[PDB]
Scaffold this active site. Structure first.
Site, PDB file in Angstrom:
ATOM      1  N   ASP A 120       0.780  -1.237   0.000  1.00  0.00           N
ATOM      2  CA  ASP A 120       0.000   0.000   0.000  1.00  0.00           C
ATOM      3  C   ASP A 120       0.808   1.282   0.000  1.00  0.00           C
ATOM      4  O   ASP A 120       1.807   1.404   0.713  1.00  0.00           O
ATOM      5  CB  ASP A 120      -0.945   0.038   1.204  1.00  0.00           C
ATOM      6  N   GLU A 173       0.979  -0.774  -4.926  1.00  0.00           N
ATOM      7  CA  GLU A 173      -0.008   0.224  -5.337  1.00  0.00           C
ATOM      8  C   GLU A 173       0.674   1.518  -5.729  1.00  0.00           C
ATOM      9  O   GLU A 173       1.127   2.283  -4.875  1.00  0.00           O
ATOM     10  CB  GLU A 173      -1.020   0.524  -4.211  1.00  0.00           C
TER      11      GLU A 173
HETATM   12 CL   LIG Z   1      -5.073  -1.578  -5.560  1.00  0.00          CL
END
Ligand SMILES: [Cl-]
Ligand SMILES: [Ca+2]
Ligand SMILES: [Ca+2]
Ligand SMILES: [Cl-]
EC number: 3.2.1.1
Lengths: 496, 496
Positions: A197, A233
């Site tokens: 993330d 990401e």
């Molecule tokens: Cl994603």
């Protein structure tokens, strides 16, 4: 880090957004596994803040409080159980690693956290990790607010706080070790990889540094030398100093251009149309196929203000969602991920969804279990797109045609296309406003194929449309611009 | 090509979108000139197609039929009159040059054209120019449809048809000469420069080749050696092989990142806020200030599906429009252009404006005259943002502070900012949700200044807010988060 670690033919992983462990366990065994799904992208399994304003957000899970595997989805016990059980059926588990930050600095100190650990953001104290003042980039950040002010300054993007979010000092070894410890704990349980993330807000080098500290996959389900699958990401549609490519050294990257563009093409916006999709793939300026992780919509952007914008297709527009998802799965480019959302009181107001913050269906902040109906749909407000026939079978279609090349593409200079995967599959689309009739070269062995979209092949027969292919490989198709589903797909396993 | 050619201090040009010549003539004399406007971006003055489906579009003027200065705004006679009259008051005229193409190839042959010239798109015949088969890039284009299919192939972008639009063969001298003739005709009348439409679909070299064939500005209003001001429409927010920079050799470029970002910041989307605007300018990754042509919204994107997306602020959101426009004008970066639209039956439907095609207010395809009301507003459905006080005075504010450096910037780590232009101006913003009170260093000579936003300085007094500055340069400000206009601006000329 590039290998999915999936098991036997399985080409796609689903994101069971905000689901509870006990429920994914079942889901794996009763559906995921028998229906050829590769793995599950789980929600941040770590203890996070408890946001009561608004009430229990979909984003409080991206505001860390400790690394105790103890969230609204369950406790460590329940978590292990899920992995164990899912792994026992060939369904991998991929953890959403939230590692660039903890919670927002504004947040009040206390125990308002999914597991009850104490923590004081203003003083930078997370005793349950433990982290403290010098473990955050406060000093390092050069901006006035300490917040990311200009995405044109690559450096402040990684050294400053994203929306006030305390930015962990990933340059330090103490921190890299604390994170690696967390990720290694997961691996020891049976994790197959991660979703790193906010990768953009972390230096590629730091991410590598941290990755390098990881053990190997659990010898109990993976081969010797299995490396954790890694997809980061990173939202890069150009215009910025930071480029997706900057992370290829760690593993795959989320190609946000994919979903954006495709949606624009299916919605028939900006003069776009399907016949222009001949060279879909790196051909449209997308990151190298085997470094890409694609999807139509991801949990974030399906809410409108994500990367793609209003162009992103979601479950709300099912007729077109199913198509874009079908095309995606049928096309060879990238590693696919299918979304599985939950319903919410969507209320648009001049540009925004005043409720795009609403969390999962619940009963006083307690996540509702996912219930299954006799017709295979879900209850308690869980959309369950992954159970929809049109998608489900295409999730399998991908498996069946794995390894086969893109070929026999056809277009009508409009929106009526079709293309095949070697000699194991063929798919035809009609996004035009007039019935689609024509004999196409399916490059498939002669026989009678069941359209896995309008139906299935059960007990030696089709329950939906039947397609007849002859030795020469040709077959006629007929898709009314107003058919239930304006696209048909057949493959080696749906042949009688 | 970089000099605006404006006249005496005048820093900004307005786009009187779709207005008629007779009306801009007046507008110049009665308002534009006395109110310090630099020039007017006129709509394509050349004969175009007459689109009856939908009825007389805002885009039929970007689908050429000949180079006769004869559009819905008027005939050559009326056109000259406008230039002559406007030039006589120091207000320059900038022609929207539509030169990469003619009309769509699909269009039916006939005389359905603003001036009645015959033309057959299917046979590629434009007898009134004249152009014919070999004067279009039909051969040259490498794509299957002859249409631009992939904006990732720089070459097909310039050699193929944009939305079916017959792409003129700009490589050929006959064509460059025909275009130069058109642009030179304009210049002889009194034009000050142009807006080169669809520059992306033309090779920089071709554009140069064509520009080089131009005469010098009319010695009757411009100095000796005056070069036509040149700003080229190029939409580049990264992600493409073609870069705005690729055109700096011809003149300025439309920086679409400007309006996009600013709007995102004013709308307070994606964690953006005004305090992050410290280094607004090349600092946010924008093309070199003196090669840029900025604006908040342009005629196209104000309709939603332009470059910026839903983030673009338009007149519809006046409270925030006025602010973004005010900030823009007050900040030194780029050469500014203010928009002036017309109202239309905006009807959104899943993502699009089913009426964003609607043309200017009219009476059976005849453009309505622009009428002026006792309160200086317009009638017949013309918005006239350029007449709004909040903008008008800021259009002048720019003039007054011309040449002065950016300084005395202040932020509250939120949305409450303020900055000044040397010692001739200061502006304060409050886009936060709580009243703004504080004494700021205005870097201005002591005295009593009139806020040119809430009012004006008339007959030795302010009609709006009064700001008191002391020798030390400090002055207190108070802007309620719900004030009429959440920003105040003062300058050397609004001092009593
Ligand atoms: Cl994603
Ligand atoms: Ca960071
Ligand atoms: Ca062209
Ligand atoms: Cl423009």
């Amino acid at each position: 880090q590039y290998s999915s670690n999936t098991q036997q033919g399985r080409t796609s992983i689903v994101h069971l957004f905000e689901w509870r462990w006990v429920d994914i366990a079942l889901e794996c065994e009763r559906y995921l596994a028998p229906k050829g799904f590769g793995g599950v992208q789980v929600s941040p399994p770590n203890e996070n803040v408890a946001i009561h304003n608004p009430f229990r957000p979909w984003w409080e899970r991206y505001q860390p409080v400790s690394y105790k595997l103890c969230t609204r989805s369950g406790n460590e016990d329940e978590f292990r159980n899920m992995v164990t059980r899912c792994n026992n059926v060939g369904v991998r588990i991929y953890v959403d690693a939230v590692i660039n930050h903890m919670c927002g600095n504004a947040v009040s100190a206390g125990t308002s956290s999914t597991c009850g650990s104490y923590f004081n953001p203003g003083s930078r104290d997370f005793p349950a990790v433990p982290y403290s003042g010098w473990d955050f980039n406060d000093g390092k950040c050069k901006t006035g607010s300490g917040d990311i002010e200009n995405y044109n300054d690559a450096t402040q993007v990684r050294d400053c706080r994203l929306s006030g979010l305390l930015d962990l000092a990933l340059g330090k070894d103490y921190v890299r070790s604390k994170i690696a410890e967390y990720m290694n704990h997961l691996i020891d349980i049976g994790v197959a990889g991660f979703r790193i993330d906010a990768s953009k807000h972390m230096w590629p080098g730091d991410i590598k540094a941290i990755l390098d500290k990881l053990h190997n996959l659990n010898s109990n389900w993976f081969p010797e030398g299995s490396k954790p699958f890694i997809y980061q990401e990173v939202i890069d549609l150009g215009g910025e100093p930071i480029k997706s490519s900057d992370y290829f050294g760690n593993g795959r990257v989320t190609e946000f251009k994919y979903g954006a563009k495709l949606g624009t093409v299916i919605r028939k916006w900006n003069g776009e149309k399907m016949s222009y999709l001949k060279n879909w793939g790196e051909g449209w300026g997308f990151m190298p196929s085997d470094r890409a992780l694609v999807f139509v919509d991801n949990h974030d952007n399906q809410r409108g203000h994500g990367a793609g914008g209003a162009s992103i297709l979601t479950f709300w527009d099912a007729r077109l969602y199913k198509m874009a998802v079908g095309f995606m799965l049928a096309h060879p480019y990238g590693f696919t991920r299918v979304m599985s959302s939950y319903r919410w009181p969507r209320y648009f107001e001049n540009g925004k969804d005043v409720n795009d913050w609403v969390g999962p269906p619940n009963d006083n902040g307690v996540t509702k279990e996912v219930t299954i109906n006799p017709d295979t749909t879900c209850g308690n407000d869980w959309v369950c797109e992954h159970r929809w026939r049109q998608i489900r079978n295409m999730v399998n279609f991908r498996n069946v045609v794995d390894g086969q090349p893109f070929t026999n593409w056809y277009d009508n200079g409009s929106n009526q296309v079709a293309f095949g995967r070697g000699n194991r599959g063929f798919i035809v689309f009609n996004n035009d406003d007039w019935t689609f009739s024509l004999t196409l070269q399916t490059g498939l062995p002669a026989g009678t194929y069941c359209d896995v979209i309008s139906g299935d092949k059960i007990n030696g027969n089709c329950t939906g449309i039947k397609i007849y292919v002859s030795d020469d490989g040709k077959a006629h198709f007929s898709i009314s611009n107003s058919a239930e589903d304006p696209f048909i797909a057949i493959h080696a396993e749906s042949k009688l």
